[PDB]
Amino acid sequence: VPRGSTSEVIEDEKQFYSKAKTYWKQIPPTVDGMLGGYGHISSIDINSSRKFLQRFLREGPNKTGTSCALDCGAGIGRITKRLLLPLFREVDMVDITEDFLVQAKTYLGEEGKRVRNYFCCGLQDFTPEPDSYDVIWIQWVIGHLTDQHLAEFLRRCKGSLRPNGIIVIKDNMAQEGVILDDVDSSVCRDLDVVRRIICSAGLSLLAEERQENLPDEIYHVYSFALR
Amino acid sequence: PPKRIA
Ligand SMILES: Nc1ncnc2c1ncn2[C@@H]1O[C@H](CSCC[C@H](N)C(=O)O)[C@@H](O)[C@H]1O
């Protein structure tokens, strides 16, 4: 029987979070650090995310705005730099690891002057300002939250969207069930689990897409656009 | 991050 929730795989919630915090504190503040030794796939990733996002930027009644985005689990700002800053007037970043947000100020260069808020906080403790963001981008971090905290964070995110705003999740997906990585202290969830969580947060899918051109050995990665 | 299937 596959596991269907984090409550089947997490022995101790406080340790699940504290171990993850310690893990990221000892990762170098680099693209290869953000990508777990896969820094080389960054351009494939960014190109695909851009195309995915541009779907929602077309003129018409539901056009997503371009005033402000929120990068969640932003790290040093890999995605902020190459995807979001070019498209959004301002960007806010949130991440638990202070050293990454400090590095971001260097990594982002001159364009980084348009990063407004650098929030150093776990997502589980973060309440984005209501009616503030056109796009909330959540990539390679949902496995760090329990199902309850993920559902709650998504509800809070919903409350922070501007009219026509969207949430984008892009992350590793398991073929089946909920799989614990006890080294980085994270989980990988199957598509049915993630969709369940999204539904419980009062959100709906606008689109879902598998990431192409990835190394064969890694978990499949999917993007979901939500409102 | 992206990672090898365990
Ligand atoms: N509970 C939590 N809340 C917020 N950020 C977290 C977190 N647990 C881990 N993180 C952050 O999640 C990031 C994962 S690495 C991925 C960074 C970025 N999303 C990108 O794709 O380039 C790290 O910056 C780490 O500090």
Phi then psi for residue A53, to 5 deg, are -65, -40
Contacts of A128 (CB under 8 A, 6+ apart): A70, A92, A94, A136, A156, A157, A159, A160
Residue nearest to atom 15 of ligand 1 (CA): A34
The reply to whether ligand 1 has any atom less than 6 angstroms from the CB of A197 is: no
Rounded Cα gap, residues A169 and A225, in angstroms: 7
Strand A178-181 to A133-139 pairing: unpaired
Rounded Cα gap, residues A164 and A227, in angstroms: 8
The amino acid sitting at A56 is F
- Check: CB of residue A167 under 8 Å from CB of residue A225: yes
Rounded Cα gap, residues A129 and A141, in angstroms: 20
Task: Please give the method by which this entry was determined.
Answer: X-ray
Rounded Cα gap, residues A138 and A87, in angstroms: 16
The reply to whether ligand 1 has any atom less than 6 angstroms from the CB of A95 is: yes
Strand A178-181 to A186-190 pairing: antiparallel
Residue ranges of the binding site of A for S-adenosyl-L-methionine: 73, 78, 95-97, 123-124, 139
Candidates A111, A126, A66; CA nearest to A138 is A126
> What resolution does the deposited structure have, in angstroms?
1.8
Rounded Cα gap, residues A182 and A128, in angstroms: 29
SS3 sequence, chain A?
A: CCCCCHHHCCCCHHHHHHHHHHHHHCCCCCHHHHCCCCHHHHHHHHHHHHHHHHHHHCCCCCCCCCCEEEEECCCCCHHHHHHHCCCCCEEEEEECCHHHHHHHHHHCHHHHHHEEEEEECCHHHCCCCCCCEEEEEEECCHHHCCHHHHHHHHHHHHHHEEEEEEEEEEEEEECCCEEEECCCCEEEEEHHHHHHHHHHCCCCEEEEEECCCCCCCECEEEEEEEC
Q: Which of A32, A48, A172 to mutate to test the interface with B (most CBs of B within 10 A)?
A: A172
Strand A68-72 to A90-95 pairing: parallel
Cβ contacts (< 8 Å) between A41 and chain B: which residues? 2
| Rg for chain B, CA atoms, rounded | 5
CATH code, A36: 3.40.50.150
Taking chain B, what is the end-to-end CA distance rounded to the nearest angstrom? 14
Phi then psi for residue A134, to 5 deg, are -75, -40
The amino acid sitting at A60 is G
Q: How many CB atoms lie within 10 A of CB A14?
A: 7
Q: Closest Cα of chain B to A83: distance in Å?
A: 17
Q: Which of A42, A173, A219 to mutate to test the interface with B (most CBs of B within 10 A)?
A: A219
- Check: CB of residue A217 under 8 Å from CB of residue B5: yes
SS3 sequence, A106-153?
A: HHCHHHHHHEEEEEECCHHHCCCCCCCEEEEEEECCHHHCCHHHHHHH
- Check: CB of residue A53 under 8 Å from CB of residue A84: no
Candidates A179, A171, A168, A119; CA nearest to A142 is A171
Taking chain A, what is the end-to-end CA distance rounded to the nearest angstrom? 32
Q: Which of B1, B3, B4 sits opposite A34 (nearest CB)?
A: B1
Q: Range of A104's domain?
A: 1-227
* DSSP SS3 for B4: strand
Torsion angle (degrees, nearest 10) of CA A101, A77, A209, A201: 30
Count of domains forming chain A: 1
Residue nearest to atom 26 of ligand 1 (CA): A97
Vertex A53 angle, CA A181 and A114, to 5°: 90
- Residue tagged 């990665």 (tokens): A221
Torsion angle (degrees, nearest 10) of CA A194, A39, A215, A224: 20
Residue of A nearest to B4 (CA): A218
Torsion angle (degrees, nearest 10) of CA A223, A179, A202, A85: -40
